[PDB]
Amino acid sequence: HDSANFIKPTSYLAHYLGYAWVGGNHSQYVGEDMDVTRDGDGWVIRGNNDGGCDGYRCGDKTAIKVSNFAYNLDPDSFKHGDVTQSDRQLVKTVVGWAVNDSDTPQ
Amino acid sequence: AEPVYPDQLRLFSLGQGVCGDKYRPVNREEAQSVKSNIVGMMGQWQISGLANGWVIMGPGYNGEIKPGTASNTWCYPTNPVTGEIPTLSALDIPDGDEVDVQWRLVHDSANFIKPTSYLAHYLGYAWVGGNHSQYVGEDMDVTRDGDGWVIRGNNDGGCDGYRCGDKTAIKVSNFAYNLDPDSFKHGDVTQSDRQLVKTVVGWAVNDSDTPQSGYDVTLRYDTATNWSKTNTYGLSEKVTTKNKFKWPLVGETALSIAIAANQSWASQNGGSTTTSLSQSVRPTVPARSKIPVKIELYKADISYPYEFKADVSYDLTLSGFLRWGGNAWYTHPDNRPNWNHTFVIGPYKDKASSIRYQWDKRYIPGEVKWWDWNWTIQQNGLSTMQNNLARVLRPVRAGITGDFSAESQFAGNIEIGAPVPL
Amino acid sequence: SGYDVTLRYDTATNWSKTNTYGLSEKVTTKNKFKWPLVGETALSIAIAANQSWASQNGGSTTTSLSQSVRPTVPARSKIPVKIELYKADISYPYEFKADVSYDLTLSGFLRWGGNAWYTHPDNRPNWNHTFVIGPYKDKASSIRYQWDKRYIPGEVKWWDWNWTIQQNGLSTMQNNLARVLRPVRAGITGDFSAESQFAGNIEIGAPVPL
């Protein structure tokens, strides 16, 4: 949702490479009047299509998709809390004895 | 851009641009982030103002955002408050075994029965209460069935209402215990029904002039199972012909010729499981002496008692039909349909059963896939919902005593004997 | 110290079972061909299709016995070693002191006037039930568990102890059950015996200078 740091540079990148209609109907500049929507595991940014427009195929607007987020940790910053268990089902168990009858530790 | 919670939006009418005392106007980006919520709070042909000369239109205009000017202004607090669910102090239950503690939890009226009934009522379930009262959560019956408990309104006599008699039920099951690490103790382990598997005896002889440690005897025992399934398909073709041969000096010879071709396809799946038990002994023998050893393996039943101190968590299931006037499901049905949903009252397991996750996601319309909490806030008020949910999610602590038991487990014995001079 | 000799011995058994089902279809036709310079040629054509399903289950068991020797040898010398494995019958006596527990089974028919089963039958039916007089194993055979659960009607699934209290009095039942569940102690002597077990022998000998 950051306009000056994410939405404008990405729209200009798409415009410089030759994609068509990067922008909404309520503005004339690249990267303005854009809509952000959440869908599944990603996000979609597209120009708003409400009203009418002038141009050969205006209405087929370019979409930008963001997904596949990854995280590169600082090694000395990770912490975790308490581990809890639920729905426990036994598999197997064993008991025994170890007997030492000699004169030294074994 | 900052997140916008729909319950904090306010509409001033102090001229074009003027916006509250500790309030700032909402930008086009933020307004679009929650467009459906804002449009749902406007008149059919209403037009209201935003920041930097934009405007939003009502449901009659399909909620369009376009440049313009208006006298109204939607506004948001300069320093907004956090609408988080509070945390209360823990509820202590007197000691006992598991069923004893569960009995004391579900029969508590002020701490369990009322908050859960109010939660079911706020979400839109019908007829939460008994026939001998008019208030929510009173005249309820508690019954034990299997591994859980059921709480339902009493149905004795008559009632007035369209479908009174179809009363909502609340189910409690799947209890779990989070132990304090330094509180667990167990008692004596006892065995019964012992059947021998195998045994071995031996000697370890040392005839050199130094102590020796390089000896080993090992006994191992395994069992396994397996399964498989297969499917096959085939095709075939055959052609037959009769042929005669009037060869010289033979006169005539008759014979038939047949040629065939076939093709086949097969597919298989399977699996297996294995369990293994191993025991070893490795003695240290003094110079010029020898030592005897012995190993045994049995099968037996095992029992012992235990005790500890823990936190208690469980599952909660609500069953009934949803009210026609209004309910909190995100699709808002109006055909009075039957409904089931499970919440996990404890640590997080997944999004569909976590109240805290869904509550902290009411600012993202694309995340709202089970219950609509903005609707409950709109119907009842923010503090009411906060206090009810805080009472529902209150931690529980208890002391536990119990017994362990299992059939046909393993039991072993390993021995090193006294040395004998050579 | 880096030496090792190892001798290992294994035995195993296995089993399996299978079921199969199948279907088939065949179609046959006779066809004639009066080709030029052949006059007439006769032949039959057949086409078939089949389908099958199979299912299998099985298991196995294995037992293993292993022995090793790893000597430490002085500088400029050598040592001999030996390992043996036998099969034999084994016996020995023993003694100890212990607590004693057992099972108790009651067989008969239940009285028509009144009985303590939770369904309270009145057809004088034959009955069997087992109690475990000792540590806990499960709810159905534990007197103490059922006695401490007479305040939860949904737990009463075998015997009705409230009915016995009503018929006889609380202290009477308490004293009788206390005498039934009394602990027992004794000293024991016995003999162990088993056939075709394992017996081993491992030896490290005296060094020989080179």
Curated annotation (Swiss-Prot), chain A:
Q: Which cysteines are joined by disulfide bonds?
A: 53-58
Q: Per UniProt, what does mutating residue 79 to A do?
A: No effect on heptamerization
Subcellular location per the Swiss-Prot or TrEMBL entry: Secreted; Host cell membrane
- Fill in the PTM field for this protein: Proteolytic cleavage and subsequent release of the propeptide trigger a major conformation change, leading to the formation of a heptameric pre-pore that then inserts into the host membrane.
Site annotation Important for oligomerization: residues: 26
Q: Which family does it belong to?
A: Belongs to the aerolysin family.
* Biological function: Secreted, cytolytic toxin that forms pores in host membranes after proteolytic removal of a C-terminal propeptide, leading to destruction of the membrane permeability barrier and host cell death. The pores are formed by transmembrane beta-strands and are approximately 3 nm in diameter.
State the domain notes: The C-terminal propeptide is required for normal protein folding and secretion; it maintains the aerolysin precursor in its soluble form and prevents premature heptamerization and pore formation.
Q: How does it assemble?
A: Homodimer in solution; homoheptamer in the host membrane. After binding to GPI-anchored proteins in target membranes and proteolytic removal of the C-terminal propeptide, the protein assembles into a heptameric pre-pore complex. A further conformation change leads to insertion into the host membrane.
Output this protein's name: Aerolysin
Which species is listed as the source? Answer: Aeromonas hydrophila
